Write a protein that binds this DNA or RNA. Structure first.
Ligand SMILES: [Mg+2]
Lengths: 71, 118, 88, 96, 275
RNA sequence: CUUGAGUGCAGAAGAGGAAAGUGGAAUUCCAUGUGUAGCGGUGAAAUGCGCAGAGAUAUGGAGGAACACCAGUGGCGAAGGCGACUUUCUGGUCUGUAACUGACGCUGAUGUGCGAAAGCGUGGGGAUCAAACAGGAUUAGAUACCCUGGUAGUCCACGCCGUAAACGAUGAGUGCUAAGUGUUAGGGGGUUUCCCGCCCCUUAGUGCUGCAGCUAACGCAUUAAGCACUCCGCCUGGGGAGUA
C-alpha cells in the first residue's frame, strides 16, 4: 500500500494541466520510443494518469508530440 | 549505374518468420540489389527454421552486395524468429561496417481482426 | 437541462413564501420545465436510454408529489393544474 | 457563455503576406458573429514530430474566444477543411 | 417519404407512392413554360425505332438554366414546384434582378435560402462555381463536360459525384456508377446532392401506372414466332437454343461490350468500374 | 415534530448516453522504381501465388473497419454494456451543508419499455476475419481438427425478433453484530515555514485474510448464505418434456 515507487510525485503539478503548453511535464511522463510510462514507474497518483493521458493525446493531433519515435 | 549502385552506406532489411527468413541489402533510399532465402540454398521447411540459415544467407547475399561494393550498411529487423540475432553476428563476420540496428517489429493498433485460429 | 438561473427565478413567483425552496408546488413546476426540455431533446434523438429512464423517474415523482398536494390541500391542487396547464 | 481556446496550423510555403491577410481575416471569422476575439498570439514556427501533408515543419497560431457556443466553431470548421492553407486545427474548452 | 396504401382490392396491395412534403405551390409560372408534343419513340419519318413508348399523359416543358451562366449575382428561393419529365423535383428562383428561372432541387433546400452562381461564391449547397476551386472530398451535381453548354452529370435523383483530387489540368472525379474521368478545370458546377431520394422505392403498383406516365408493353422474345425474333418458335415453351442471348436484331446483350474503343475520351476514361 | 424521502447551496469525479467532426499506425488492392526463382504453409507434406518478374524493398494513391501504450481486483451505469481524441445536447451518483417543505415512504400482481451475439426485412458499404462450399493432407474412412482460398455475414441507418452459464447460477428495501488490510472520489483536524508531503478520524462503493454465528459440506463473514421485518416471484421425486 503501495509497493510501487514513491507516493506523491504530483507536488509540482495540479490542479489542471497541461494541456499542451508545457514540455516540462511532458517527456518526464513518457518513454523515448513514444509509448507511455505506466503508473508503476513514475510514482504519480491515479487521476493524473487519467489527465496526462488525454493531455498528450491532444498534443498528438496538434503534432506537438509523436505517435511514435523509434528512428 | 544503374544495375551497379556503388556506395559506402546502404540498407539491409531482414525477415524471419518461424519457418523462413529472407534478407536483402539495398540503398539508403532504398533500391534493391541482393537477397537470399534459406530455401534457395537447398534447405527445406524444417531446416529454414535454423539459426545457421541466418549466417549462410547473410554471407550469400553479402557477397554480391560487396561485389557492387559496400563498406557500411544499416540493418532493419522484423520477424520474431530465431535468426534475427544470428544473421547480425555472421554478417559482421563478412567484414562489413554496420553502425545501427533498428528493430521495427510492425505492430498495429488493432487495424483488423487477426485469425481466430487457434 | 436546466440552469440555475431559470430555476432560481421561477421559484420566486410560485414559492408559497419567501425563504422557501421546497413546498412541492415549486418541485412540480421545476420538474415540469425539465421534462419539457428533455422531451424535445428526446424527439430530436428518437433513441436513447438515459433520458427515458430519467424522465420516468421525474414524471413518476411528479405524480407522487401531486398526489400529496391533493390531500394536504385541494385548492392549491386545482390552482396549479390550471396555472401550469398540466395533468388533465 | 463559455471559454474556448483554439489552435490553427498553416504551411510555411505560403508568402508572408497571405499569412497576414489570412490571420486578420481569420480572427475576423471568429469575431464577426458577436463572439469575442479576446487574446490572439502566435506560437509561430516550429518543427513537427511528423509530417502531416508532406511538411516536416510548419506554423502555429493560438487565439482565444469566450462566447456562447454558436458563433465561432460553427464557422471555423466549415472554413477549415476546405481551405488548403489551414492544415489541422483543434478547439477545446477551458480544461487542462 | 412513401405512404403505403391500405389494401382494399387486388390492384393496390403492393402499391406505394410518394408523400409530396417538399412542395409549396402546385401551379407553375406561365412564362418559362414551353409546349411539347410527343413522338412515341419514332423518327422524322414515322417509323418505330425505339420500342414501347407512347400512350401516356400530356405535359409541358419547364425550362432550366443548367448553365447557371450569370455569375456573382446573389439570388433567393421563394418556391418549389413539381416536374413530371424528371425524377428530380425542381425549384423556382427569384434572382436579384427580378428574373425567374427554374433549377433542379438539391436535398435539404430551405425556401428563403439564398444561392449564388459565381467564382467568389463560397461553398454551400446550391452555389454554382467551377471545379478547380472546389476542395477535394465533396459531392457535386450538374457538372458540364464542356464550358458553357449546360450540365449533363449527376442531374438525376439522389446523391452525386465525388472529387478525389485534382491536377491543374485536367481534374479527376468519381461518379455514382463509381467510375472515373478526367474533367476540365473550368467547367461550371455546383454542390450538394439532388433532391428526391426515394423516387425508387415507389412500387408502381399496377399496370396502368406505367401507362399513365406513359410507357407501354414489351413482349418477350421466346414467345414470338421465329421471323420476328431469333429465340421464337418452338413447340410448347421455348428454351433459348442458341448460346449468346440475342437482341431481336442479332447483336447480343449478355456480357458483350459495345463501347467503341476509338473514341477520343478513352484516355480520359480510367478505372472503368460500372458499365 | 424531524431522524426516513425529496428540494436546496458550494463542490468532486467519471469509458454514462445520442449526433457530427478530426488523426496515426497496420492489413489489403492497385500503380510506379529496384531486382531474381522462389514465396507461403506443416509435426511431415501437398493445393495455391510466381518468369505476364512474385515475394521482398521504397514512394505515393484509394478504400472500409478497429483504435498500441495508457489499463489497474480502476471507474461509470439499473442490467445488456461502455475504452483513440474534440465540440453540441444530456441523464444520474457521492460528499459537506443545513437554512428549506414536514412522512410525501417500501414492495409491486396485470401493463408498459430497454435488452449481448446470432437472426430477419428495406436500402447503402465491402479492408480484414469467416459458417456453408471447393481443393489439398491426415485417416481404415473424416462430409472433423491441420492447410490454401472463400459467399452470406461481420459494418452503417430505419424497422422487427425479444432469448443466454443475461452468473456472484445469491430478488428489492431498511435496521443491528469482532477486527485487520490494501484500493478509488471526497471531507475535518494535528504536526509542516507552507502537508503537497506524515499521521488520526469520517462518509460512499470497491477487493482479500479472518471471529462470533450459520451451513449437510465446500464455504459467507458489515459488499452476510449471520440476527430479524415487510412486499414480490418461484419449488414440491426423475424420464416422459420445456414435448403435445
Ligand atoms: Mg466503508
Amino acid at each position: 500500500g503501495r509497493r510501487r515507487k514513491k507516493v506523491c510525485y504530483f507536488t509540482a503539478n495540479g490542479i489542471t494541466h497541461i494541456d499542451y503548453k508545457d514540455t516540462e511535464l511532458l517527456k518526464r511522463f513518457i518513454s523515448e520510443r513514444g509509448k507511455i510510462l505506466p503508473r508503476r514507474v513514475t510514482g504519480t497518483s491515479a487521476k493524473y494518469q487519467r489527465m496526462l493521458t488525454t493531455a498528450i493525446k491532444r498534443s498528438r493531433h496538434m503534432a506537438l508530440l509523436p505517435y511514435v519515435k523509434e528512428e | 549505374r544503374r544495375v551497379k549502385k556503388n556506395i559506402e552506406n546502404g540498407v539491409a532489411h531482414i525477415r524471419s518468420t518461424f519457418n523462413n527468413t529472407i534478407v536483402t541489402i539495398t540503398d539508403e533510399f532504398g533500391n534493391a540489389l541482393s537477397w537470399s532465402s534459406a530455401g534457395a540454398l537447398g534447405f527445406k521447411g524444417s531446416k529454414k527454421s535454423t539459426p545457421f540459415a541466418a549466417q549462410m544467407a547473410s554471407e550469400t547475399a553479402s557477397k554480391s552486395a560487396m561485389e557492387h561494393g559496400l563498406k557500411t550498411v544499416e540493418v532493419t529487423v522484423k520477424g520474431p524468429g530465431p535468426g534475427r540475432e544470428s544473421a547480425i553476428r555472421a554478417l559482421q563476420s563478412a567484414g562489413l561496417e554496420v553502425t545501427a540496428i533498428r528493430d521495427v517489429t510492425p505492430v498495429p493498433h488493432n487495424g483488423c481482426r487477426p485469425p481466430k485460429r487457434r | 437541462a436546466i440552469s440555475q438561473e431559470r430555476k432560481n427565478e421561477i421559484i420566486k413567483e410560485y414559492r408559497v413564501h419567501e425563504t422557501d425552496t421546497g413546498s412541492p408546488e415549486v418541485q412540480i413546476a421545476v420538474l415540469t420545465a425539465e421534462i419539457n426540455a428533455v422531451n424535445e431533446h428526446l424527439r430530436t434523438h428518437k433513441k436513447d436510454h438515459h433520458s427515458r429512464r430519467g424522465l420516468l423517474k421525474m414524471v413518476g415523482r411528479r405524480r407522487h408529489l401531486l398526489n400529496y398536494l391533493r390531500s394536504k390541500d385541494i385548492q392549491r391542487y386545482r390552482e396549479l393544474i390550471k396555472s401550469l396547464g398540466i395533468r388533465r | 457563455m463559455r471559454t474556448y481556446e483554439v489552435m490553427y496550423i498553416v504551411r510555411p510555403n505560403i508568402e508572408e503576406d497571405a499569412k497576414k491577410a489570412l490571420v486578420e481575416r481569420f480572427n475576423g471569422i471568429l469575431a464577426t458573429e458577436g463572439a469575442e476575439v479576446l487574446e490572439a498570439k502566435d506560437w509561430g514556427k516550429r518543427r513537427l514530430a511528423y509530417e502531416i501533408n508532406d511538411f516536416k515543419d510548419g506554423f502555429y497560431n493560438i487565439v482565444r474566444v469566450k462566447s456562447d457556443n454558436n458563433k465561432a466553431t460553427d464557422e471555423f470548421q466549415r472554413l477549415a477543411k476546405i481551405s488548403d492553407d489551414i492544415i489541422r486545427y483543434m478547439v477545446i474548452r477551458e480544461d487542462e | 417519404a412513401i405512404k403505403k396504401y391500405k389494401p382494399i382490392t387486388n390492384g393496390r396491395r403492393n402499391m406505394t407512392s410518394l408523400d409530396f412534403a417538399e412542395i409549396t405551390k402546385t401551379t407553375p409560372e406561365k412564362s418559362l413554360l414551353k409546349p411539347l408534343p410527343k413522338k412515341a419513340g419514332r423518327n422524322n419519318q414515322g417509323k418505330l425505332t425505339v420500342r414501347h413508348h407512347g400512350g401516356g399523359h400530356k405535359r409541358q416543358y419547364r425550362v432550366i438554366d443548367f448553365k447557371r451562366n450569370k455569375d456573382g449575382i446573389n439570388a433567393k428561393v421563394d418556391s418549389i414546384q413539381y416536374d413530371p419529365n424528371r425524377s428530380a423535383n425542381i425549384a423556382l428562383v427569384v434572382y436579384a434582378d427580378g428574373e425567374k428561372r427554374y433549377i433542379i432541387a438539391p436535398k435539404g433546400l430551405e425556401v428563403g435560402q439564398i444561392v449564388e452562381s459565381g467564382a467568389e461564391a463560397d461553398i454551400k449547397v446550391g452555389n454554382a462555381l467551377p471545379l478547380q476551386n472546389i476542395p477535394v472530398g465533396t459531392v457535386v451535381h450538374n457538372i458540364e463536360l464542356k464550358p458553357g453548354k449546360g450540365g449533363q452529370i449527376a442531374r438525376s435523383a439522389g446523391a452525386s459525384a465525388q472529387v478525389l483530387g485534382k491536377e491543374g489540368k485536367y481534374v479527376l472525379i468519381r461518379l455514382r456508377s463509381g467510375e472515373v474521368r478526367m474533367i476540365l478545370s473550368t467547367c461550371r458546377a455546383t454542390i450538394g446532392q439532388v433532391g428526391n431520394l426515394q423516387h425508387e422505392l415507389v412500387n408502381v403498383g399496377k399496370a396502368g401506372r406505367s401507362r399513365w406516365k406513359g410507357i407501354r408493353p414489351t413482349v418477350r422474345g421466346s414467345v414470338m414466332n421465329p421471323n420476328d425474333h431469333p429465340h421464337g418458335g418452338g413447340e410448347g415453351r421455348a428454351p433459348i437454343g442458341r448460346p449468346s442471348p440475342m437482341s431481336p436484331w442479332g447483336k447480343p446483350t449478355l456480357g458483350k461490350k459495345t463501347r467503341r474503343g476509338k473514341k477520343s475520351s478513352d484516355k480520359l476514361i480510367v478505372r472503368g468500374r460500372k458499365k
